[PDB]
Structure 1
């Protein structure tokens, strides 16, 4: 309701599918998280975060955690040099 009306006092209004998407990601662990940094922190790939604000912080995250990235996120399989799951690239011959 709130996102709708804040766009609606101007006249714009996005289709009620984007809204009911962005809800069931910014709040799916019960609690209500933000996404400027907090929610997006939950990203499997710390390299998309490296692309977000400051490479060093999320490199530090990757080094202290030591996860083997499953190589599905766009950041990872794009930087490694393969073809990625994005758009064209879920499949091959």
Structure 2
């Protein structure tokens, strides 16, 4: 009940009562940006915490 309001559906689904949260997410046609740590595990993406809180760019010498 405390988590009933959150942008990430995958977190609330993975916590408990998966089907009620799934129905609420599909009837509201909710779109989640895969920002929760639990949301990125479902899809298999690098986390947004620690070493995944930035990017790495190469400096190629030649244009």
- TM-score normalised per structure 2: 0.72
Compare the two structures and name the one with the higher strand fraction. 2
Q: Using CA pairs under 8 Å that are at least 6 residues apart, name the structure with larger relative contact order, 1 or 2.
A: 2
- Identify unmatched segments of 5+ residues in structure 1: 1-36
Stretches (4+) displaced over 2 A: none
- Identify unmatched segments of 5+ residues in structure 2: 57-63
Work out whether 1:92 is the aligned partner of 2:61: no
- TM-score normalised per structure 1: 0.52
**Number of residue pairs the alignment of both structures matches:** 56
Out of 4, 28, 31, the residue aligned to residue 68 of structure 1 is 31
